[PDB]
DNA sequence: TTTTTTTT
């Protein structure tokens, strides 16, 4: 009687483990007599206790195998192969369907029975978040499906404002739901070569503020960014594929991803302006700044720029129709909790505390 | 009859040995009869004498095998896989509890009949060390707290200060009390990414004299440290779960460990300079030199460099409630063994000698 | 019949061979009949003729093997493993005690029946060296004890003097005595990574003729030495462990070995002068050169720069008690040989010749 | 039936072949029926026709093997293993003796019944060489002794002169005589790593036309050679082992070989000038040019570059006593052959023609 | 039954294929029944249709092997081995003779019954090349002898003249005839190191279009190349061996190939002028230009660039005894074919048309 | 896969 390689591969698929050492370590834990398994008794980790009783007999024989890392290497390949099949064939819409569950599962880290951050802090985050912008949740949903459709030309939004205006931090929170990356163009022309190549294969992207020759009217440092950007037409418009670069490594050729430009109050030509769909003009705001200062557990528990907190803001405001259809079951499961655990009045109180610019939990 | 790879892997687990050459060398010692073994008789190394009598039979058969390095690879994999499981599943508290358990076990030897450490010399070390910064039994606890909570930008501290300011001496004991690694980035990083592979699965990492450029304005020779740092403005705050590279080996998506940057006082970029619990600094205290000039065990046995000395300091001062919850029996057991033979007066007899640069033993 | 991998492994341990090609080459010689092995009959190499007759039978079957490199690989691994086990367990006292036993075995052969050395010439070397500085032998004892204790940030010595003032000559002899390696600091600060990677497991290091800057006043062309040394201050301090470099291999972590540095009289940052415990300043002296001119065989046989010369000096000048207990037996026996073989008047005559600048013999 | 790997290893040893491809290619030729082997019948290559008949039967079975490159890999390694054994155990005199035996074997072929060489032409070459410098044969003897003795800080000879003064010609013949490598060190600092790597296990090295910077007053184009080389001070002196690097390999460590430096007429730092034991000026001379102009079969056949020419010069001029003891017998054979085939007057007539600038032969 | 690895190795030797994937792909084609193989029926590729029927059965079994790439690697190694044997053993005359046989075999196809070429158009090509220079066929014959003898200093030829006067056309045809590589010395001095690596094991090299300096006086753009060539005397004189380098390979040493230098009419340092055996001046000629306008099939089929055209020129003009002994039989047969298909009157009528600058054909 | 090459 012998190790079933098949059962190891099932576990690797079900865990979605794709690191050989990690698979090896965890599967060896099943070798002890399941019936007393104290990790099961404690209900520590589901990726153990949901599986040990099934996998036990095979794990005993696994521990006696002389070949262990070879079994695990094949199992890890099966998981990576699955990703690469899907990476080819799936739509941006279905890929966002990951991004939802990619966070709807992380919600349980705080709000499952471990409770390891109080959900009400995230509601206070959701309050502070929704106070940050006019129509904030619609402005989210606008930007969201704007990225899903990836419509050529009609792609890029400009986050203008003063310094310390929350724009990049909002973009960072927004990026949390989907990933993506920020990038620089104030660099000299040669540095752009590899710099632009950084963007390769990101689902969404951002730019850092420019340094732009006219900005020092405000003393906004008058670097190359503006003039550089006005040359870089086609990447933005996304009409056609373009080539991209890596140090010591070969070029790649793809349609350039969609994204956001952060900027401060530089002057601009009509040409570069016309590239954009839309401009936003952020500012720091009197209640909302002092609110966080009075409410810093939101900063402390990393809530303020969490896509989980965007996601809860979404589940709050947006109707079930707005969500990836089969996931709606999980959305309503969250709506059910959210609307039961929280009265409107706590949400009212929280948001109104932000309207007093004061501690959002009170 | 056959080599048991199982019995080998037990020894690797129980020694926590994680080098294939060390492991191989170690096990081959057992091939002689423990019944006669001079090392067993001499009680020189526990990693031998605890085990020789058990493994002798298996080691004899291991000694004939033709696969010897392969057995040791699989055993080392098992030990490293165990670490990787703990890496992700444990709370930061349990990690420190593990670490302290090991220091405690070693101290049980040190001041056991065999370990031949003078606890008064060690406590003279404790006296000297608390004089290195009179705050430190608090500030150490503040550091430990902040590390366990792992809070962004509070994830880092600065140790500015010139030579012979002690910033090394403290970082040394602290990086022993914790698990962790030193690191450097003095150079343009285009090929240098694999150095951050050392940050994989670390509780803590530390930087020292990561050079500024332009510090030659104040006689600190220029180097690319600050320039790399204030580009990668993330990892003092702690945001991207970078996929850490390793030579010929798998690579590890994680947020970078928390830490400290230590330096002889270069000029520093402003956006970087924010990213700490404390921008804080170390100033030479000649009387501490005067003490060690008069207090020589403390360097000769490296006592003042040791996490062991910090642990002794914490046992002495801190209330048991401040410790991790579960281990506290061992904490009182040692508090007893300290208070049994240290009065405050004798501890002060050490302490104020240091404070006035007098020799500690008296 | 079948290869005894065990007998091969014995020979590698016996010889301390650790190059697989050298091991292979050596073992193959044993395929021919020791019974007429001309090397044995010439008694030319001990690592051959001591072993040939024992290993002959196994080597005949090894000569047919298809695995040969694999058998040698495992044998070399066993020798390497023993070295790492020793690095992690021996006191530096024992390490040096073992090193002395190896050199004393070489001296047995050199002055044995094959005896190809002449003890008169070697002791002429001792007289020349002992004349090179006042109280020479006491300075060697200081250096050795310093390297044995390895007390941190008090563990490097620096030699200064013009060219051909003999500082390199002395350093070479010391390095053979302890075992260790030379390395070059006069490089771009970048280059040092796989340079210092050689210091792994070494007992001692030496850095040569370090180019300061501004010495061209003194006709000394400026360079990188002072830069790279005054960078690597922690390596001098020895307070903390470092990670070290090797190709196609993971890093290894350890404290850096103590050592010696040499210079022509460049500029000195006193940040380094604080770290050197000691300096010794060398001057060229004509009579030593005139002696050498008339005494070519010293250089031609490399005597004055061999650590075997230093060992003879110490055996001459030091009490038996200064040596570790086990070798005191051998030390006594070498004092016996010396006293039998030299009258004191002979040594006095030789040192008198050295002083006069005649050739040492007459 | 099976391949005899032993016979392949024999063939590799007996041909000293150490390229796996060349070994393979050679060995495969034997598979055809020896009795018709046209290469044998035409006696074109000795490393074929000596061995084909012996190896034939095993070559046929080797031709069927599925494993051919593995078999060759084992054979090549034993040839390499022998070289390393010898590198650590022969005297420098014995090495030169072995090298001489090899050239003498080649001379037996060149001036055989087979073999193209006209001994009168090669002896004409010797006349031109002995004319190039005063006491040419004594100069060669002095250099050979210096290379055998390898005395530290007295190891390197400097050739300088105008262009077309003879320097690389003479270096070529010396290098062919002793064996060794040429190196170019006018390079940038980085590639020197692998460049100096070439010296591993070599007997001599030669540095080609090292450029000074400056001195373009002499119409000498500038370059880094001299300034670069003065950093390598240690490598010339050869007082201590140095660590050396090849691509994709971990460092070797050995004493850096002795050798020759050639340059056009730059000026040199005293630090470097002091390290040359000897300097030879080369001066263009009109009659050598007009002689060579009339005698160009010397150039066409490369006679004056060849170490065979220098060896013939030594056999003509030097006493039998000066050769190492075992070669003295073959030296007497060749001296006899030479005297039998040339009177002194014929040789003196050649020298006389060269001094006239007339064509050598008459 | 089993795959014959021998039949594959024969096919590789037969086709001289030394690319594993090309070897692999072609062998697989044979697995279908040659009897209906349309590539056979079309007689489309000689590498296929000559061999399919013979290898059919082995290809069928090969198609089921699980070891396919292993078989191919051993086969390809055999072809590489043969080349390296020949590189060391053959004379330069045999090399050229082998090369000529290859071209003659392609001509037998090109002008065969299957032959897609027209021998009349290729003869028209020969007429145009014969007009490019005076005594063209004598010039070619001189060049080849100069290459075969490879006599030191007398090794290199210079082509110069205005742009569009055919120099690179002739270079390309000669390079095809002998085989070799083009090189670009106009680089800066660093990567020039890897550039020359291309010359390894080549029979012949071409230095394309060496840019001078100060020719801007006559509208020539300045560049590095000439200065780089003055830095390479020995590579051209070919008197002594030199080191050569490739990416990811350790250096090799050989005599650098003979070759051709080409330039527009910059001025040439007399240092460099001395390298060259011969200089050939190209002049633009209008009647060639007008002829090319009319006989475009020359350019369109790339006739005038091809070494096959030069070989036809040699066959048509040169006496049989000038060719290497073995191929004289084939040469006689091709002369006979050419004498059959063309009267001298026809050929001279072609030459007359070119001299008129009218189209070649009437 | 690194290391070397690329990158600087
Ligand atoms: N309206 C606001 N209310 C509260 N805090 C705010 C507000 N605007 C900005 N801040 C604070 O400003 C800090 C910086 O925000 P962020 O980096 O996103 O700004 P930015 O405008 O993109 O920056 P900059 O353009 O200066 O680089 C954050 O801590 C954020 O909370
Ligand atoms: N505050 C201090 N005052 C005086 N001596 C000190 C002080 N701190 C450490 N020392 C002593 O000076 C030496 C160096 O101490 P340490 O390495 O910890 O300082 P550092 O500031 O980190 O120095 P460096 O930057 O040179 O490594 C040691 O011998 C130590 O005993
Ligand atoms: N003190 C001395 N007096 C006279 N001659 C000396 C002296 N020391 C060395 N020599 C001679 O100088 C030669 C080289 O000595 P050594 O290399 O040790 O000198 P150094 O000063 O260390 O030189 P460098 O800085 O070049 O390495 C010795 O072999 C010996 O011939
Ligand atoms: N002493 C001499 N007098 C006249 N002509 C010489 C002399 N030595 C050499 N020659 C001629 O000069 C040519 C080149 O000489 P060599 O190959 O030694 O070059 P070099 O320029 O002197 O040396 P290097 O390239 O090392 O600087 C020889 O082939 C020969 O034709
Ligand atoms: N002698 C000639 N007279 C007139 N036109 C010529 C002559 N030789 C070549 N041509 C024309 O010049 C074109 C280019 O020829 P080719 O490429 O050999 O010129 P080149 O001067 O050697 O070029 P380059 O120096 O740029 O490599 C030919 O295709 C032909 O049309």
Task: Report the greatest alpha carbon distance in chain A.
Answer: 80
Of A133, A166, A358, the residue with max ligand 1 atoms within 8 A of its CB, to mutate for a pocket test, comes to A166
**What string of DSSP letters covers C273-288?**
HTTEEEEEE----HHH
Q: Could you give the CA distance from residue B214 to residue B219 in angstroms, rounded to a whole number?
A: 9
Atom of ligand 5 nearest to the CA of E299: 29
D168 CB near ligand 4 (under 6 Å)? yes
How crowded is the C-beta side of D269, counted as CA atoms within 13 Å?
19
Compute the half-sphere exposure of residue E57: CA atoms within 13 Å on the CB side of its CA: 5
Q: Whose CA is nearest to atom 7 of ligand 4?
A: D165
Residue carrying the six token digits 């055998």: D148
| Residue D276 near chain C (CB below 8 Å) | no
Give the closest of C84, C227, C239 to B22, CB-based.
C84
Residue C283 CB: number of other CB atoms within 10 A? 9
Q: Which structure tokens are listed for C70?
A: 């694999």
**What is the distance in angstroms between the Cα of D149 and the nearest Cα belonging to chain C?**
7
Detail the protein residues whose CB sits closer than 7 A to any atom belonging to strand F.
Answer: A 194, 246-249; B 188, 190-191, 194, 245-248; C 247-249; D 190, 194, 245-249; E 191, 194, 245-249
What gap in Å lies between CA C241 and CA C154, rounded to an integer?
Answer: 16
Which residues, 6+ apart, have CB-to-CB distance to B141 below 8 Å?
Answer: B314, B318, B322
Is C168 known to sit in a ligand binding site? yes
Provide the 8-state DSSP code for D166: S
Rg (CA), chain C: 23
Question: Hey, is the C-beta of C90 within 8 angstroms of any chain B C-beta?
Answer: no
Cα gap C243→C254, rounded to integer Å: 7
Q: Phi and psi at residue E286, in whole multiples of 5°?
A: -65, -40
DSSP secondary structure letters along D211-255: PPSS-GGGT----SHHHHHHHTHHHHH--S-EEE--TTSPPEEEP
Q: Is D45 on the interface with C (CB under 8 A)?
A: no
* HEC-encoded secondary structure of B162-191: CCCCCHHHHHHHHHHHCCCEEECCCCCCCC
Q: Give B191's contacts in chain A (Cβ within 8 Å).
A: 248
Q: Taking Cα atoms as reference points, which of C252, C245, C243, C158 lies closest to residue C209?
A: C158
Strands, E, within E255-356: which ranges?
A: 259-263, 276-281
Distance between CA B107 and CA B128 in Å, rounded? 19
Q: Distance between CA B294 and CA B355 in Å, rounded?
A: 12
Question: Which residues of chain A make contact with B85, given a CB cutoff of 8 A?
Answer: 22, 25-26, 29
Question: Distance between CA atoms of E39 and C85, rounded to whole angstroms?
Answer: 67
Please tell me whether E286 is known to bind a ligand: no
d(CA E88, CA C298): 47
Which residues in B lie closer than 8 A to residue C84 (C-beta atoms)? 19, 21-22, 25
Contact (CB, 8 A) for A251 and A245: yes
How many CB atoms within 10 Å of residue A149? 13
> B33 CB near a chain A CB, below 8 Å?
no
Using DSSP's 3-state secondary structure scheme, residue A158 falls into: strand
CA of B247 to C1' of F1 (A): 8
Counting Cα atoms < 13 Å in the Cβ hemisphere of E163 gives 9
Distance CA C171, CA C174 (A): 5
- Burial B194-228, CB ≥16 within 10 A → b, else e: ebbbbbbbbbbbbbbbbbbbebeeeebbbbbbbbb
Residue E240 CA to residue E259 CA, distance in Å, equals: 16
Distance D242 CA to F1 C1' (A): 28
Q: By the 8 A CB rule, do B262 and B209 touch?
A: yes
**C neighbour chains, 3+ CB pairs within 8 Å:** B, D
C-beta of residue C74 within 8 angstroms of C-beta of residue C9: yes
Residues with Cβ within 8 Å of C239's Cβ and at least 6 positions away in sequence, in order, are B168, B169, B172, B305, C152, C153
Token pair for A335? 């709506």
- Beta-carbon count within 10 A of D232 CB: 18
β-pair type (E181-183, E205-207): parallel
Ligand 2, residues at Cβ distance < 6 Å: B 161, 163-169, 264, 282, 284-286, 288-289, 292; C 153, 233-234, 237, 239
Closest C-chain CA to D242 = C182
| Residue in the structure block whose two tokens are 């839309």 | A278
* Among B4, B5, B1, B51, CA closest to B29: B51
As a whole number of angstroms, the distance between CA C256 and CA C202 comes to 9
Q: Which residues of A touch B78 (CB under 8 A)?
A: 24-25, 28, 68
Residue with tokens 């921008």: B279
Whole-angstrom distance, CA of residue E210 vs CA of residue E226: 6
Instruction: Determine whether A160 is exposed, middle or buried from the number of CB atoms within 10 Å of its CB (0-12, 13-18, 19+).
Output: buried
Closest CA to D231 of D287, D193, D176, D182: D193
User: Hey, what are C159's tokens?
Assistant: 């030699």
| Cβ-contact B82, B90 below 8 angstroms | no
Name the closest residue on chain D to residue E247, using Cα atoms: D247
CA A341 → CA A119, A178, A180, distances in Å?
9, 27, 33
Cα dihedral sign for D317, D318, D319, D325?
negative
Q: CA E314 to CA E332: how far, in whole Å?
A: 12
Q: Which residues contact E281 (CB under 8 A, 6 or more apart)?
A: E160, E161
E94: alpha, beta or left? (left if phi > 0; alpha if psi -120 to 50): alpha
Residues placed in the known binding site of B for ATP: 161-168
For residues D137 and D315, the answer to whether their CB atoms sit within 8 Å is no
Question: Which nucleotides of chain F are near protein (any atom < 7 Å from a CB)?
Answer: 1-8
Residues in chain B: 362
Long-range contacts of D352-359 (CB under 8 A, 24+ apart): D353/D291, D354/D127, D354/D128, D354/D131, D354/D287, D354/D288, D354/D291, D355/D131, D355/D287, D356/D287, D356/D291, D357/D286, D357/D287, D357/D288, D357/D289, D357/D290, D357/D291, D357/D294, D358/D290, D358/D291, D358/D294, D359/D291, D359/D294, D359/D295
Residue D184 Cβ < 6 Å to ligand 4: no
Q: Which of C3, C18, C85, C148 to mutate to test the interface with B (most CBs of B within 10 A)?
A: C85
Q: Give burial (CB, 10 Å; 0-12/13-18/19+) of A310.
A: buried
| Token output for C49 | 């003729």
Atom of ligand 5 minimally distant from the CA of E285 = 3
Q: List Cβ<8 Å contacts ≥24 apart for D27-36.
A: D27/D55, D27/D59, D27/D62, D27/D72, D28/D59, D28/D62, D28/D63, D28/E78, D28/E81, D29/D59, D29/E85, D30/D55, D30/D56, D30/D59, D31/D56, D31/D59, D31/D60, D31/D62, D31/D63
Q: Quick one: closest CA in C to D233, which residue?
A: C209
Neighbour count for residue D67 (Cβ, 10 Å): 12
User: Looking at residue E218, what DSSP letter applies?
Assistant: G
D270 Cα–ligand 3 center, Å? 15
**Listed residue (A322, A237, A227) closest to A277, CA to CA:** A237
Nearest to B168 among C84, C237, C274 (CB): C237
Measured between beta carbons, which residues in chain D are less than 8 angstroms from residue E77?
21, 24, 68-69
Contact, D312 vs D123, CB < 8 A? yes
CB contact under 8 A, C168 and D274: no
Judged on CB neighbours under 10 Å (0-12, 13-18, 19+), E258 is buried
Give, in order, the Cα–Cα distances in Å from D208 to each of B169, C307, D187, D259.
52, 36, 12, 11
Ligand 2 centroid to Cα of residue B163, in Å, is 6
Q: What is the CA radius of gyration of chain D?
A: 23
SS3 E158: strand
Residue A142 CB partners (closer than 8 Å, separation 6+): none
Please name which ligand lies nearest the alpha carbon of B153. Answer: 1
Q: Which residues pair with C160 in a beta bridge?
A: C263, C281
Record: contact C152-B305, CB cut-off 8 A: yes
Q: Is D18 on the interface with C (CB under 8 A)?
A: no
| Subunit contact D77:C21, Cβ cutoff 8 A | yes
DSSP assignment letter at E221:
P
Method: cryo-EM
Backbone angles phi, psi at D213, to 5 degrees: -90, 160
Whether residue D168 and residue E88 make contact (CB cut-off 8 A), yes or no, is: no
- Run of H or E residues at B160: strand B156-160
Q: What is the DSSP letter of E34?
A: G
Q: What is the DSSP letter of A224?
A: B
Is the CB–ligand 5 distance for residue E293 below 6 Å?
A: no
Buried b (16+ CB within 10 A) or exposed e, B8-23: bbbbbeebebbbbbbb
**Any chain B CB within 8 A of the CB of C188?**
no
Cα distance between the two ends of chain A: 63
Query: Pick from D52, D55, D57, D58: which is nearest to D36 by CA?
Result: D52
From CA D298, how far away is CA D294, in angstroms rounded? Answer: 10
- Residues of C with CB below 8 A from B208's CB? 234
Pocket flag, ligand 1, residue A209 (CB < 6 Å): yes
Cα–Cα distance between C353 and C348 in angstroms, integer?
A: 8
Q: What whole-number distance in Å separates Cα of residue D216 and Cα of residue D230?
A: 20
Tell me the nearest-neighbour CA distance from D132 into chain C, angstroms. 31
Half-sphere exposure of E175 (CA within 13 A, CB side): 21
Q: DSSP of D181-192, one letter per residue?
A: EEE---S-TTTH
Q: Is A182 exposed, middle or buried (0-12, 13-18, 19+ CB in 10 A)?
A: middle
- Taken in order A43, A48, A51, A55, the sign of the CA dihedral is negative
Strand boundaries in E211-341, DSSP class E: 242-244, 252-254, 259-263, 276-281
**Exposure of C50 by Cβ count < 10 A (0-12 exposed, 13-18 middle, 19+ buried)?**
middle
The DSSP code sequence of B289-332 is HHHHHT--HHHHT-GGG-HHHHHHHHHHHS-GGGS-STTHHHHH
Question: Which nucleotide has its C1' atom closest to residue E194's CA?
Answer: F5
Which helix (H) or strand (E) element contains residue C262? strand C259-263
Write b or e for each residue in E85-112: b if 16 or more Cβ atoms lie within 10 A of its Cβ, otherwise e: beeebeeeeebbbebbeebbeebeebbe
D182 in reach of chain E (CB within 8 A): yes
3-class state of residue E156 by DSSP = strand
E163 is in an annotated binding site: yes
Q: Cα(E37)–Cα(E53) distance, rounded to whole angstroms?
A: 10
Which member of B22, B66, B299 has the closest CB to residue C85? B22
Within 13 Å of residue A171, how many CA atoms lie on the same side as its CB? 25
The C-alpha angle A191, A192, A198, rounded to 5 degrees, equals 105
Q: Are D240 and C164 a contacting pair at CB < 8 A?
A: no
Give all chains having 3 or more CB-to-CB distances under 8 Å with chain E.
D
Among the bound ligands, the one closest to the CA of E303: 5
Contacts of E82 in chain D (CB under 8 A): 25
The two three-digit tokens of residue D357, written as one number: 């600038």
């Amino acid at each position: 009687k012998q190790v079933s390689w098949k059962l190891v591969t099932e576990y690797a698929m079900e865990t979605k483990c794709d690191d050989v050492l990690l698979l090896l370590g965890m599967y060896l834990e099943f070798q002890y007599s399941f019936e007393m398994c104290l990790k099961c008794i404690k209900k520590e980790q589901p990726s153990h206790y949901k599986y040990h009783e099934k996998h036990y007999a095979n794990a005993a024989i696994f521990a006696d195998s002389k070949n262990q890392k070879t079994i695990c290497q094949q199992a890890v390949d099966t998981v990576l192969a699955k990703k690469r099949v899907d990476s080819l064939q799936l739509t941006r819409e279905q890929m966002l369907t990951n991004r939802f569950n990619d966070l709807l599962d992380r919600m349980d880290i705080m709000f499952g029975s471990t409770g390891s951050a109080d959900i009400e802090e995230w509601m206070a985050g959701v309050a502070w978040l929704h106070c940050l912008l006019p129509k904030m949740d619609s402005v989210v949903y606008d930007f969201l499906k704007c990225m899903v459709y990836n419509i050529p030309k009609k792609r890029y939004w400009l986050f203008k404002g003063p310094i310390d205006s929350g724009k990049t931090t909002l973009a960072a929170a927004l990026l949390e739901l989907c990933g993506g990356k920020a990038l620089n163009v104030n660099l000299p022309l040669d540095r752009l070569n590899f710099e632009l190549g950084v963007a390769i294969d990101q689902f969404l992207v951002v730019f850092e503020d420019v340094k732009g020759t006219g900005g020092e009217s405000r003393d906004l440092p008058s670097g190359q960014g503006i003039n550089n950007l006005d040359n870089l037409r086609d990447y933005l418009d996304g009409s056609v594929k373009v080539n991209l670069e890596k140090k010591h490594l070969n070029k790649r050729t793809q349609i350039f991803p969609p994204g956001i430009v952060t900027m401060n109050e530089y002057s601009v030509p009509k040409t570069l302006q016309a590239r954009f769909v839309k401009q936003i003009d952020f500012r720091p705001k009197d209640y909302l700044k002092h609110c966080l200062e009075r409410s810093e557990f939101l900063l402390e528990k990393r809530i303020i720029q969490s896509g989980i907190a965007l996601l809860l803001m979404l589940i709050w405001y947006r109707p079930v129709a707005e969500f990836a259809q089969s996931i709606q079951s999980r959305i309503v499961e969250w709506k059910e909790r959210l609307d039961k655990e929280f009265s409107l009045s706590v949400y009212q109180k929280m948001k109104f505390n932000v309207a007093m610019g004061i501690g959002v939990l009170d």
